[PDB]
Structures are given as C-alpha cells and as structure tokens.
C-alpha cells in the first residue's frame, strides 16, 4: 500500500521486544519499505487461502499474543534480508530485491512452515510439538534459503541432492541466527519445538547422532521415506560444516576450524557458482574445495580444513 514509513514496536513469539518497520495509511500495516521491493506480512486468519490480508494494526504496537507470530515473521525476514545483503551482497532471495511476503496464522494447529515458491507460510503449531514457527529465526532463514537455492543451484529435493539442499538451509539458517546474535547455536528449531521440553530441537549440526541422524557417509539412509532421507542425510553435511567452522576430532580425524564467516563464504560460493541440480555429496566436497581455492588459494589452511572436514564425515 501507499503510505508513510513508520517504526512500530512489539513482542515476538519468545516474549522479546523488537522494533518493526511499518507503513501508515489509517492503519499501521506490516509493510517494511526499507528493504528491496518491500517485506510484507499477512494474516491468513486460520484459513488456508494465501496470502490473506496485509496485516493491519490500529496503533503500531504489537504486544498481543495474536500479534507475536506476525512480529517475528516480519522481523526475521528483515534480518535474513540484512544477512544476505550485508554478508553476501545478495539482494533478497532472488538477488534482484524481490518482495518478501509471509503469511502467519495459516490453517489451524499446523506444525510446519514452508517457502511455496512465491512466499513464506507459517503454521501456529499445535502448542505441543510446536509453538508458532515464525518464532524460530533459524526456521525463517532455513525456509528463505530454499528460495535462494531454487534461484541458484536448483538442487533437486530427493536423495543426496536433496540432503545437500536441506543442509544448505540448515547452514544459512544457523548463520543468520548467529548474525542476529541473540541466542545462536548449531541446533535447528530449538526456539519453537516442544515448549514443554528444555534443551531439545529438530536436529543437531554439531552432533547429528544426538537425534538419530547420520554423522558419517557410511551411515547414510537409503530408504524411500522423507524423499530419500533429505532431513536425515543432511546430518552428514551439517556435521562437515560444523567441523569446518568450529573444528573437532570426528571419528579420529582432526579438523582445524576456520570460523563461521569463512564457512559462509565457502558454501555461498559453492552454492551460487558450482553446484548443479543433481550434485551429490562427493560433488559438494569438490565444489567447496574449488570455492575455498578461489577465495583463499590452493595451499591455504581454509582449503586444507574443507578437505579434513569431508574426510572426517567419509565423503571422498
Ligand atoms: Ca496494536
Ligand atoms: Ca538458537
Ligand atoms: Ca538454532
Ligand atoms: Ca523444546
Ligand atoms: Cl521474541
Ligand atoms: Cl490485503
Ligand atoms: Cl493478548
Ligand atoms: Cl524443509
Ligand atoms: Cl560427533
Ligand atoms: Cl566423534
Ligand atoms: Cl566431533
Ligand atoms: Cl579434495
Ligand atoms: Na531425528
Ligand atoms: Zn528444508
Ligand atoms: Zn564427532
């Protein structure tokens, strides 16, 4: 809508206060004009019709419980936008400042969130398995990273390609979480999963085995569930990324850590320059080695650590 750019204030799903960019035209709308072609957040009002209504609020204060998922989908879309722009010089998910649209209060008791090709969609969860999913910055960034992948490598969502696709979203979801700098970690969905249970999450990048996921290629899942194990086999690449950043000795293979920023550069370059729709794990290792080579030189520590990390997870 046309109107005045304004800054409201509210509380997200976890109860923290944050400022949000709005547009004033009789009501204050969740429309942030400061980022690319705009960030727009909509109320689906418990229906499944999309996108719903551009979110309108009378007074520019967003402290009601009903407001919290909207606050976070809007705010974390902005953080994700800032991450890709400031850290990778990428303007929105398509590199051309495409508007970011998100709908919250999608359906009822819906325990999921997804990028549908044109927008983000967030369930409220059922209150037991999940609370509203936009409350997890890593979830928001994980899903928007699928759009980045769709606009770059186009990794196919099945088997090893699909597990790379998932791991890319977990890696950049986590890097966004660290960029936001509030309560980062190397777990996925910890903020919104199982409100009754402290210290769990959907999966762990530092220790995939904590939740039954493989941490080595010899333990790869080869069944047909989950599109050939895309959220299961992602543990193998997630652990490799964790080793590259933080180091460790995994199955007796020592990896010298090079930090989060360099992990980010290496994988972003691999994703945008070298991966193709059918890249398998071995081809990912080759792309990451080539990317670290381009960035740091063939004799660098960074190249050696990428090699160690893939060796440690059994990806030749
Ligand atoms: Ca209000
Ligand atoms: Ca966290
Ligand atoms: Ca996390
Ligand atoms: Ca929990
Ligand atoms: Cl919050
Ligand atoms: Cl509307
Ligand atoms: Cl309330
Ligand atoms: Cl997913
Ligand atoms: Cl481990
Ligand atoms: Cl180990
Ligand atoms: Cl380890
Ligand atoms: Cl190699
Ligand atoms: Na699991
Ligand atoms: Zn995903
Ligand atoms: Zn280990």
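Sequence proposed for the structure above (316 residues):
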């Amino acid at each position: 809508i046309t109107g005045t750019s304004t800054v409201g204030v509210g509380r997200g799903v976890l109860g923290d206060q944050k400022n949000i960019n709005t547009t004033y035209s009789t009501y204050y709308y969740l429309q942030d004009n400061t980022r690319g072609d705009g960030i727009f957040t909509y109320d689906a009002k418990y229906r499944t019709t999309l996108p719903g209504s551009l979110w309108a609020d009378a007074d520019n204060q967003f402290f009601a419980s009903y407001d919290a998922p909207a606050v976070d989908a809007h705010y974390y879309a902005g953080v994700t936008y800032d991450y890709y722009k400031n850290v990778h010089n990428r303007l929105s998910y398509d590199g051309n400042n495409a508007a970011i649209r998100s709908s919250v209060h999608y359906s009822q008791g819906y325990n999921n969130a997804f990028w549908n090709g044109s927008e983000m969609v967030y369930g409220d969860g059922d209150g037991q398995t999940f609370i509203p999913l936009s409350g997890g910055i890593d979830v928001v960034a994980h899903e928007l990273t699928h759009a980045v992948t769709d606009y770059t490598a186009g990794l196919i969502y099945q088997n090893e390609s699909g597990a790379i696709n998932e791991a890319i979203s977990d890696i950049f979801g986590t890097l966004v979480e660290f960029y936001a700098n509030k309560n980062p970690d190397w777990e996925i969905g910890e903020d919104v999963y199982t409100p009754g249970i402290s210290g769990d999450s959907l999966r762990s990048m530092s220790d995939p085995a904590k939740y039954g996921d493989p941490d080595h290629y010899s333990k790869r899942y080869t069944g047909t569930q989950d599109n050939g194990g895309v959220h299961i086999n992602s543990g193998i690449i997630n652990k490799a990324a964790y080793l590259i950043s933080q180091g460790g000795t995994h199955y007796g293979v020592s990896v010298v850590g090079i930090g989060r920023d360099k992990l980010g550069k290496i994988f972003y370059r691999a994703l945008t320059q070298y991966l193709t729709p059918t890249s398998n794990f071995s081809q990912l290792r080759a792309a990451a080695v080539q990317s670290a080579t381009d960035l740091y030189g063939s004799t660098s520590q960074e190249v050696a650590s990428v090699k160690q990390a893939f060796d440690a997870v059994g990806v030749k």
